[PDB]
Amino acid sequence: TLLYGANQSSKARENKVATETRKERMAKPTIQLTGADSQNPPFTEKNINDWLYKTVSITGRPIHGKGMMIPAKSYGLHGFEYLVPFVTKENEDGSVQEGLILNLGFIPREYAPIWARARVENVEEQTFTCVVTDGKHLSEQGGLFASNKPCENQWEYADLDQLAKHTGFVNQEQVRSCILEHVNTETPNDERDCRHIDICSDYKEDYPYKFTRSGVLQQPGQMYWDLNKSASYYSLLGL
Amino acid sequence: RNRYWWYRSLYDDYVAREAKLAFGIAAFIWLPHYYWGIHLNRAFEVNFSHRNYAHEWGPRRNRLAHSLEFEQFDMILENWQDLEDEYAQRGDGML
Amino acid sequence: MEVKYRGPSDDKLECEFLENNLLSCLREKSVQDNVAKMTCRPEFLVWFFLECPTKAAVYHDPKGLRNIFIQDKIKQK
Amino acid sequence: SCTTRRFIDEKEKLEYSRGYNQQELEASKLRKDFVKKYIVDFDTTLYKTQVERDWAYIAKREYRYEVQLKSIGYGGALANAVLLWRIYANKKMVFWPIPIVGALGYLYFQPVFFQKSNKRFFDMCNVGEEYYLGRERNKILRECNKILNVEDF
Amino acid sequence: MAQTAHQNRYQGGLCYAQCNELFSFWNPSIQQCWKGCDFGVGRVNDPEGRIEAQQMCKRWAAELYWTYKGELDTIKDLRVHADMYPTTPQNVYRACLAGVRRQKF
Amino acid sequence: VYCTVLAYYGWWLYDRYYLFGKNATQDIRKDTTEVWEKRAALNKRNWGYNAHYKPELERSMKKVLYADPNYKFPIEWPERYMAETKTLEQVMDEEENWEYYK
Amino acid sequence: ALFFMANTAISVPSVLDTSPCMKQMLAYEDCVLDANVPQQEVIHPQWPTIWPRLLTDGKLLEFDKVPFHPENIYNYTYMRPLTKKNKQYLYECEEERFVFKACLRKVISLKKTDKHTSWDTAEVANLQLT
Amino acid sequence: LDYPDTDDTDDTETFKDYKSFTGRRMVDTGIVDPLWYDIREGKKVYYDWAGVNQPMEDI
């Protein structure tokens, strides 16, 4: 119990340092990616630490047909994180495509199926301002006795290799490297903002709801205050 | 009342034991129904209040927005007329 | 009334149309509609302030409005 | 709306979970004092205008369900836990854990649920500058804006 | 009495009784007569209140039916009979005036 | 006694319906003139007649204008809901020859 | 019947109108209604600038209208200039018109800034919860 | 394939529609299901996941 509390306190301190680092990274102005630079993004498995948790603005075309729905909960709503294969470069026939994985934000459980929406999704070239992110807490959310079923759209955690295989893009390593979380950079950069998706109380926005700069910094349930509370509780239990 | 009268009023058949035991259980099975009905009645009342507001103050807010836009145009028009006066003074030196 | 939300368009062609209507209205109303033919449509004026916030902010700014007036005068000769 | 209410509830939960700063605590104390006095410590039917009475009663009902009833429920849960412990320990039915531990649980949880939802009750009193309740709320709001160096509604 | 002030005709008092006695039982003018009783409650005794009540009757007739500006001012005969039905603004005005006349207090 | 009470209730309904005038005349004489005048004053309502603008603004010009007993509205209230019976030329001529009081 | 619904929610009040300049708009509209002006463009306080021809000749459209032919009085109402009586009874409504215009201009001067931390939860302050 | 006529069963036209720019984009939007058959030689062969029998031989 005391050992567990000490470990929780150490993890809280490490998470605080990581959150400060991510805030410093995201405070920088967005890096533009248009034209050929979008078709050959600088992100790679080896250089990812340079661009990790860093705001870029990349142009490309999203594929809403093959969207993955990673289970997630946002403000008491059980919905899905809406990952899509983001196509940057492709040949005229369309057989050969390369791109990335784009987290469009939280989409409620009711509207997750394509036939459940009153829209025909736009799959043309669009510019998205996204934070390049490792995609860590999504990959560590499945828990025990949970596993993804691909070859169908069944997901429990963001397994980067399985998502990359599902995308079918040729540049498998770059797709596996990271995901780009659709973010709104006109929001406060503190992790205490307590508005994690770019919405209002009346939810007047349109699904999926993009993240605020505080939402990207937010690890659900593992922030330093939660770990400090857990450490205090376990210290009290032990003593 | 009259026990004998009430014990054979129902077609000379006796169900008084079950009637007596019915009150105790029936005193509690209606609580969830009652509370959810309170919730539904409040929802209906809120919807009727919204209907009244939309019927009455719905049109009025649109006129207020229309007048806001017209007032923005009026401010721009005043500045434009000041510029026109200045251009009337400076015939071509303004350009 | 279940009215859905859609933010200001800021579309290039739509805002060009609305700004042309706004300029026509400014030129007509600045002389109390003494033109031979008046083409101003007041209603579209409203929409100019509902779907072109950038151009509306430019028009409110005194220096931007002065530049717009100078260019319009040059265009009208 | 249900979505608005759920968002408010969950945002309040997140704010209480992360912490409450120092100036935020001062502003919360001011808001809680105003709400407590003008709603809980006053008969909301004694205001002059109908708007004040209606919306003060709405705020008081929100307080009753979100603080009074929630604190009663949580204190009763704590009393039930202590009661089960005492019944198991004494191997017989006991009655003392209900009143005493229920009152202690209510006194422990009422400040918690009041601190969690202080802004919700404070904002529900925004009937307008034309009314006495609205004027007092606006004065307290200006003080809180001075403390927090922000602007609220 | 959908347009009137009382739930039942018995709450109207002596004025509604006189309105009932004025027209036949199938005549809908009675209700209009009742409205006259509503207009001259605190006005009949006041010398200008009576004129105000007559103006109220004119406004009521103008609101019920389409009317022209001089139409209600050139009526030759303001008397009513049992078989007078509120088919015209003139008839509505006459019934309302008759109701006003029968409002004691 | 149930039959007697039912018969009394039925007769009461019958008498209330058929002797409305007599009942109302008897009721009108149970109170003096002053009481009936007070009741009539309590029940006095405008019913929506002459509901013109009531100036709440303190600097409003129409406030002082309405306080003036000689103020003439452009048209009488019952005439605000009546169709015009004269030609547009006559209307414009009368309005252009109109002169303000005071 | 008597208590079939078993409850009535009298606690929920009428929706409070929280519009910025609604009171001034209604006051100005009542005043203009008092003037008894055939032209409806006078409903907007900005009519002298938006439709200045109301004060000169009344020609508000360049023959691009569809109100039918001038056969009755109730035609071309906007194509009818304000008369002396209309102008007087509209001038009597000048202070309320000015107050409405001032309220509109002040509302226009209000801009959303970065200190509005309560913007995402402004419904509670707007009193939308009953 | 194309039985009895292309007016009724326009298999080749639909095959070309799915294999063109508009068809690929419509499938990308997710509102249109993928093509359920392949025209191999002169035979329309339904995929296994289509859940239908193969067309009868034209004897």
PDB file of N, CA and C in Angstrom, chain E residues 20-88:
ATOM      1  N   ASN E  20     -80.773  37.954 -21.935  1.00  0.00           N
ATOM      2  CA  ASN E  20     -81.534  36.767 -22.312  1.00  0.00           C
ATOM      3  C   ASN E  20     -82.973  37.123 -22.656  1.00  0.00           C
ATOM      4  N   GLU E  21     -83.586  38.010 -21.872  1.00  0.00           N
ATOM      5  CA  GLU E  21     -84.954  38.430 -22.148  1.00  0.00           C
ATOM      6  C   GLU E  21     -85.062  39.264 -23.416  1.00  0.00           C
ATOM      7  N   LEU E  22     -83.962  39.863 -23.871  1.00  0.00           N
ATOM      8  CA  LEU E  22     -84.031  40.747 -25.029  1.00  0.00           C
ATOM      9  C   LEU E  22     -84.189  39.965 -26.328  1.00  0.00           C
ATOM     10  N   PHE E  23     -83.479  38.849 -26.467  1.00  0.00           N
ATOM     11  CA  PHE E  23     -83.462  38.080 -27.701  1.00  0.00           C
ATOM     12  C   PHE E  23     -84.049  36.693 -27.476  1.00  0.00           C
ATOM     13  N   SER E  24     -84.458  36.061 -28.572  1.00  0.00           N
ATOM     14  CA  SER E  24     -84.956  34.697 -28.513  1.00  0.00           C
ATOM     15  C   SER E  24     -83.831  33.741 -28.133  1.00  0.00           C
ATOM     16  N   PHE E  25     -84.217  32.571 -27.617  1.00  0.00           N
ATOM     17  CA  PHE E  25     -83.240  31.675 -27.005  1.00  0.00           C
ATOM     18  C   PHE E  25     -82.235  31.117 -28.004  1.00  0.00           C
ATOM     19  N   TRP E  26     -82.564  31.089 -29.292  1.00  0.00           N
ATOM     20  CA  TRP E  26     -81.636  30.611 -30.307  1.00  0.00           C
ATOM     21  C   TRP E  26     -80.805  31.728 -30.919  1.00  0.00           C
ATOM     22  N   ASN E  27     -80.993  32.961 -30.474  1.00  0.00           N
ATOM     23  CA  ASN E  27     -80.311  34.099 -31.071  1.00  0.00           C
ATOM     24  C   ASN E  27     -78.924  34.246 -30.458  1.00  0.00           C
ATOM     25  N   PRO E  28     -77.848  34.161 -31.247  1.00  0.00           N
ATOM     26  CA  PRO E  28     -76.502  34.348 -30.689  1.00  0.00           C
ATOM     27  C   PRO E  28     -76.181  35.784 -30.317  1.00  0.00           C
ATOM     28  N   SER E  29     -77.090  36.732 -30.566  1.00  0.00           N
ATOM     29  CA  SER E  29     -76.838  38.120 -30.195  1.00  0.00           C
ATOM     30  C   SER E  29     -76.708  38.280 -28.691  1.00  0.00           C
ATOM     31  N   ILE E  30     -77.308  37.368 -27.923  1.00  0.00           N
ATOM     32  CA  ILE E  30     -77.294  37.480 -26.467  1.00  0.00           C
ATOM     33  C   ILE E  30     -75.864  37.585 -25.962  1.00  0.00           C
ATOM     34  N   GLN E  31     -74.981  36.727 -26.475  1.00  0.00           N
ATOM     35  CA  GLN E  31     -73.579  36.774 -26.075  1.00  0.00           C
ATOM     36  C   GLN E  31     -72.990  38.156 -26.316  1.00  0.00           C
ATOM     37  N   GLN E  32     -73.245  38.729 -27.495  1.00  0.00           N
ATOM     38  CA  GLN E  32     -72.776  40.084 -27.759  1.00  0.00           C
ATOM     39  C   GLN E  32     -73.384  41.064 -26.771  1.00  0.00           C
ATOM     40  N   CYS E  33     -74.683  40.922 -26.497  1.00  0.00           N
ATOM     41  CA  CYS E  33     -75.311  41.717 -25.451  1.00  0.00           C
ATOM     42  C   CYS E  33     -74.564  41.549 -24.139  1.00  0.00           C
ATOM     43  N   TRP E  34     -74.177  40.310 -23.819  1.00  0.00           N
ATOM     44  CA  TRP E  34     -73.411  40.056 -22.606  1.00  0.00           C
ATOM     45  C   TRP E  34     -72.122  40.861 -22.592  1.00  0.00           C
ATOM     46  N   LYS E  35     -71.444  40.952 -23.739  1.00  0.00           N
ATOM     47  CA  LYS E  35     -70.217  41.738 -23.797  1.00  0.00           C
ATOM     48  C   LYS E  35     -70.490  43.194 -23.457  1.00  0.00           C
ATOM     49  N   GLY E  36     -71.640  43.718 -23.883  1.00  0.00           N
ATOM     50  CA  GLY E  36     -72.018  45.053 -23.461  1.00  0.00           C
ATOM     51  C   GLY E  36     -72.073  45.169 -21.952  1.00  0.00           C
ATOM     52  N   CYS E  37     -72.674  44.175 -21.294  1.00  0.00           N
ATOM     53  CA  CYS E  37     -72.704  44.157 -19.838  1.00  0.00           C
ATOM     54  C   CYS E  37     -71.301  44.170 -19.254  1.00  0.00           C
ATOM     55  N   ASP E  38     -70.336  43.573 -19.955  1.00  0.00           N
ATOM     56  CA  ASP E  38     -68.962  43.599 -19.474  1.00  0.00           C
ATOM     57  C   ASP E  38     -68.338  44.976 -19.639  1.00  0.00           C
ATOM     58  N   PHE E  39     -68.713  45.701 -20.692  1.00  0.00           N
ATOM     59  CA  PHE E  39     -68.066  46.974 -20.974  1.00  0.00           C
ATOM     60  C   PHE E  39     -68.555  48.081 -20.054  1.00  0.00           C
ATOM     61  N   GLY E  40     -69.795  47.998 -19.589  1.00  0.00           N
ATOM     62  CA  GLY E  40     -70.357  49.045 -18.764  1.00  0.00           C
ATOM     63  C   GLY E  40     -70.476  48.670 -17.304  1.00  0.00           C
ATOM     64  N   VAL E  41     -69.452  48.023 -16.752  1.00  0.00           N
ATOM     65  CA  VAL E  41     -69.506  47.625 -15.348  1.00  0.00           C
ATOM     66  C   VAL E  41     -69.292  48.834 -14.445  1.00  0.00           C
ATOM     67  N   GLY E  42     -68.119  49.452 -14.533  1.00  0.00           N
ATOM     68  CA  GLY E  42     -67.829  50.612 -13.715  1.00  0.00           C
ATOM     69  C   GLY E  42     -67.928  51.913 -14.480  1.00  0.00           C
ATOM     70  N   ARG E  43     -68.578  51.875 -15.644  1.00  0.00           N
ATOM     71  CA  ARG E  43     -68.604  53.010 -16.552  1.00  0.00           C
ATOM     72  C   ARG E  43     -69.983  53.600 -16.792  1.00  0.00           C
ATOM     73  N   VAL E  44     -71.056  52.831 -16.611  1.00  0.00           N
ATOM     74  CA  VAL E  44     -72.384  53.310 -16.986  1.00  0.00           C
ATOM     75  C   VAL E  44     -72.774  54.534 -16.168  1.00  0.00           C
ATOM     76  N   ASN E  45     -72.455  54.533 -14.872  1.00  0.00           N
ATOM     77  CA  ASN E  45     -72.866  55.641 -14.018  1.00  0.00           C
ATOM     78  C   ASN E  45     -72.050  56.901 -14.282  1.00  0.00           C
ATOM     79  N   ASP E  46     -70.787  56.755 -14.662  1.00  0.00           N
ATOM     80  CA  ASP E  46     -69.967  57.919 -14.977  1.00  0.00           C
ATOM     81  C   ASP E  46     -70.408  58.514 -16.310  1.00  0.00           C
ATOM     82  N   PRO E  47     -70.634  59.830 -16.388  1.00  0.00           N
ATOM     83  CA  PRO E  47     -71.150  60.409 -17.642  1.00  0.00           C
ATOM     84  C   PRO E  47     -70.247  60.184 -18.844  1.00  0.00           C
ATOM     85  N   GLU E  48     -68.928  60.218 -18.659  1.00  0.00           N
ATOM     86  CA  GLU E  48     -68.008  59.886 -19.739  1.00  0.00           C
ATOM     87  C   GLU E  48     -67.720  58.397 -19.829  1.00  0.00           C
ATOM     88  N   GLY E  49     -67.939  57.652 -18.746  1.00  0.00           N
ATOM     89  CA  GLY E  49     -67.791  56.212 -18.812  1.00  0.00           C
ATOM     90  C   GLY E  49     -68.796  55.563 -19.740  1.00  0.00           C
ATOM     91  N   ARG E  50     -70.002  56.124 -19.825  1.00  0.00           N
ATOM     92  CA  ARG E  50     -70.996  55.605 -20.758  1.00  0.00           C
ATOM     93  C   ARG E  50     -70.537  55.776 -22.202  1.00  0.00           C
ATOM     94  N   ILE E  51     -69.977  56.943 -22.528  1.00  0.00           N
ATOM     95  CA  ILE E  51     -69.434  57.164 -23.864  1.00  0.00           C
ATOM     96  C   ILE E  51     -68.257  56.233 -24.117  1.00  0.00           C
ATOM     97  N   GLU E  52     -67.424  56.018 -23.096  1.00  0.00           N
ATOM     98  CA  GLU E  52     -66.312  55.085 -23.234  1.00  0.00           C
ATOM     99  C   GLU E  52     -66.809  53.675 -23.521  1.00  0.00           C
ATOM    100  N   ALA E  53     -67.876  53.251 -22.842  1.00  0.00           N
ATOM    101  CA  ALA E  53     -68.437  51.924 -23.076  1.00  0.00           C
ATOM    102  C   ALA E  53     -69.011  51.803 -24.483  1.00  0.00           C
ATOM    103  N   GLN E  54     -69.666  52.856 -24.973  1.00  0.00           N
ATOM    104  CA  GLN E  54     -70.162  52.831 -26.347  1.00  0.00           C
ATOM    105  C   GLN E  54     -69.013  52.742 -27.349  1.00  0.00           C
ATOM    106  N   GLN E  55     -67.921  53.463 -27.092  1.00  0.00           N
ATOM    107  CA  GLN E  55     -66.740  53.344 -27.943  1.00  0.00           C
ATOM    108  C   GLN E  55     -66.161  51.937 -27.886  1.00  0.00           C
ATOM    109  N   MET E  56     -66.184  51.317 -26.707  1.00  0.00           N
ATOM    110  CA  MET E  56     -65.720  49.941 -26.580  1.00  0.00           C
ATOM    111  C   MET E  56     -66.575  49.000 -27.413  1.00  0.00           C
ATOM    112  N   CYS E  57     -67.890  49.220 -27.420  1.00  0.00           N
ATOM    113  CA  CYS E  57     -68.770  48.420 -28.267  1.00  0.00           C
ATOM    114  C   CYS E  57     -68.437  48.608 -29.741  1.00  0.00           C
ATOM    115  N   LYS E  58     -68.168  49.849 -30.148  1.00  0.00           N
ATOM    116  CA  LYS E  58     -67.801  50.105 -31.539  1.00  0.00           C
ATOM    117  C   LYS E  58     -66.505  49.394 -31.910  1.00  0.00           C
ATOM    118  N   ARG E  59     -65.508  49.448 -31.027  1.00  0.00           N
ATOM    119  CA  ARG E  59     -64.248  48.754 -31.279  1.00  0.00           C
ATOM    120  C   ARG E  59     -64.452  47.247 -31.354  1.00  0.00           C
ATOM    121  N   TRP E  60     -65.288  46.700 -30.471  1.00  0.00           N
ATOM    122  CA  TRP E  60     -65.560  45.267 -30.486  1.00  0.00           C
ATOM    123  C   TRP E  60     -66.213  44.844 -31.795  1.00  0.00           C
ATOM    124  N   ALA E  61     -67.203  45.612 -32.259  1.00  0.00           N
ATOM    125  CA  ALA E  61     -67.832  45.310 -33.540  1.00  0.00           C
ATOM    126  C   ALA E  61     -66.832  45.413 -34.684  1.00  0.00           C
ATOM    127  N   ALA E  62     -65.967  46.431 -34.654  1.00  0.00           N
ATOM    128  CA  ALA E  62     -64.971  46.591 -35.708  1.00  0.00           C
ATOM    129  C   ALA E  62     -63.952  45.462 -35.706  1.00  0.00           C
ATOM    130  N   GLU E  63     -63.662  44.891 -34.540  1.00  0.00           N
ATOM    131  CA  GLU E  63     -62.711  43.788 -34.480  1.00  0.00           C
ATOM    132  C   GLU E  63     -63.336  42.462 -34.885  1.00  0.00           C
ATOM    133  N   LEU E  64     -64.623  42.258 -34.603  1.00  0.00           N
ATOM    134  CA  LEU E  64     -65.253  40.991 -34.967  1.00  0.00           C
ATOM    135  C   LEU E  64     -65.424  40.863 -36.476  1.00  0.00           C
ATOM    136  N   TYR E  65     -65.903  41.917 -37.131  1.00  0.00           N
ATOM    137  CA  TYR E  65     -66.162  41.910 -38.563  1.00  0.00           C
ATOM    138  C   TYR E  65     -65.373  43.016 -39.249  1.00  0.00           C
ATOM    139  N   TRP E  66     -65.103  42.821 -40.537  1.00  0.00           N
ATOM    140  CA  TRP E  66     -64.555  43.905 -41.339  1.00  0.00           C
ATOM    141  C   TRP E  66     -65.561  45.044 -41.405  1.00  0.00           C
ATOM    142  N   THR E  67     -65.095  46.259 -41.133  1.00  0.00           N
ATOM    143  CA  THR E  67     -65.966  47.422 -41.087  1.00  0.00           C
ATOM    144  C   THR E  67     -65.289  48.577 -41.806  1.00  0.00           C
ATOM    145  N   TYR E  68     -66.099  49.530 -42.248  1.00  0.00           N
ATOM    146  CA  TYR E  68     -65.602  50.767 -42.824  1.00  0.00           C
ATOM    147  C   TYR E  68     -65.737  51.899 -41.813  1.00  0.00           C
ATOM    148  N   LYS E  69     -64.979  52.972 -42.048  1.00  0.00           N
ATOM    149  CA  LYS E  69     -64.789  53.980 -41.009  1.00  0.00           C
ATOM    150  C   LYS E  69     -66.094  54.673 -40.633  1.00  0.00           C
ATOM    151  N   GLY E  70     -66.907  55.043 -41.619  1.00  0.00           N
ATOM    152  CA  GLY E  70     -68.168  55.688 -41.313  1.00  0.00           C
ATOM    153  C   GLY E  70     -69.335  54.760 -41.079  1.00  0.00           C
ATOM    154  N   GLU E  71     -69.137  53.460 -41.304  1.00  0.00           N
ATOM    155  CA  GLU E  71     -70.255  52.526 -41.380  1.00  0.00           C
ATOM    156  C   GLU E  71     -71.046  52.475 -40.079  1.00  0.00           C
ATOM    157  N   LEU E  72     -70.359  52.450 -38.940  1.00  0.00           N
ATOM    158  CA  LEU E  72     -71.044  52.374 -37.656  1.00  0.00           C
ATOM    159  C   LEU E  72     -71.514  53.729 -37.151  1.00  0.00           C
ATOM    160  N   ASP E  73     -71.220  54.814 -37.863  1.00  0.00           N
ATOM    161  CA  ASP E  73     -71.642  56.143 -37.447  1.00  0.00           C
ATOM    162  C   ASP E  73     -72.856  56.649 -38.212  1.00  0.00           C
ATOM    163  N   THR E  74     -73.311  55.917 -39.230  1.00  0.00           N
ATOM    164  CA  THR E  74     -74.447  56.331 -40.044  1.00  0.00           C
ATOM    165  C   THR E  74     -75.630  55.382 -39.896  1.00  0.00           C
ATOM    166  N   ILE E  75     -75.703  54.648 -38.787  1.00  0.00           N
ATOM    167  CA  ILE E  75     -76.813  53.730 -38.565  1.00  0.00           C
ATOM    168  C   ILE E  75     -78.064  54.539 -38.251  1.00  0.00           C
ATOM    169  N   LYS E  76     -79.118  54.331 -39.042  1.00  0.00           N
ATOM    170  CA  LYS E  76     -80.343  55.102 -38.860  1.00  0.00           C
ATOM    171  C   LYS E  76     -81.065  54.703 -37.579  1.00  0.00           C
ATOM    172  N   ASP E  77     -81.220  53.402 -37.347  1.00  0.00           N
ATOM    173  CA  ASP E  77     -81.995  52.887 -36.225  1.00  0.00           C
ATOM    174  C   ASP E  77     -81.107  51.985 -35.383  1.00  0.00           C
ATOM    175  N   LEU E  78     -80.900  52.363 -34.125  1.00  0.00           N
ATOM    176  CA  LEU E  78     -80.114  51.566 -33.195  1.00  0.00           C
ATOM    177  C   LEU E  78     -80.960  50.601 -32.378  1.00  0.00           C
ATOM    178  N   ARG E  79     -82.273  50.586 -32.582  1.00  0.00           N
ATOM    179  CA  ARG E  79     -83.130  49.657 -31.865  1.00  0.00           C
ATOM    180  C   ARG E  79     -82.878  48.231 -32.333  1.00  0.00           C
ATOM    181  N   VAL E  80     -83.132  47.279 -31.441  1.00  0.00           N
ATOM    182  CA  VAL E  80     -82.946  45.867 -31.734  1.00  0.00           C
ATOM    183  C   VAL E  80     -84.279  45.156 -31.554  1.00  0.00           C
ATOM    184  N   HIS E  81     -84.412  44.015 -32.222  1.00  0.00           N
ATOM    185  CA  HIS E  81     -85.580  43.163 -32.073  1.00  0.00           C
ATOM    186  C   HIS E  81     -85.120  41.755 -31.716  1.00  0.00           C
ATOM    187  N   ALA E  82     -86.091  40.874 -31.471  1.00  0.00           N
ATOM    188  CA  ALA E  82     -85.780  39.536 -30.979  1.00  0.00           C
ATOM    189  C   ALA E  82     -84.987  38.735 -32.001  1.00  0.00           C
ATOM    190  N   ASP E  83     -85.314  38.886 -33.283  1.00  0.00           N
ATOM    191  CA  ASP E  83     -84.694  38.109 -34.349  1.00  0.00           C
ATOM    192  C   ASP E  83     -83.525  38.833 -35.001  1.00  0.00           C
ATOM    193  N   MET E  84     -82.797  39.651 -34.250  1.00  0.00           N
ATOM    194  CA  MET E  84     -81.623  40.341 -34.766  1.00  0.00           C
ATOM    195  C   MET E  84     -80.397  39.478 -34.505  1.00  0.00           C
ATOM    196  N   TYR E  85     -79.760  39.014 -35.574  1.00  0.00           N
ATOM    197  CA  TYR E  85     -78.629  38.115 -35.432  1.00  0.00           C
ATOM    198  C   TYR E  85     -77.325  38.841 -35.740  1.00  0.00           C
ATOM    199  N   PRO E  86     -76.225  38.469 -35.084  1.00  0.00           N
ATOM    200  CA  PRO E  86     -74.952  39.184 -35.277  1.00  0.00           C
ATOM    201  C   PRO E  86     -74.259  38.802 -36.581  1.00  0.00           C
ATOM    202  N   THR E  87     -74.976  38.967 -37.690  1.00  0.00           N
ATOM    203  CA  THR E  87     -74.421  38.682 -39.003  1.00  0.00           C
ATOM    204  C   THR E  87     -73.637  39.849 -39.582  1.00  0.00           C
ATOM    205  N   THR E  88     -73.793  41.046 -39.027  1.00  0.00           N
ATOM    206  CA  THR E  88     -73.143  42.246 -39.520  1.00  0.00           C
ATOM    207  C   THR E  88     -72.531  43.020 -38.363  1.00  0.00           C
TER     208      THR E  88
END
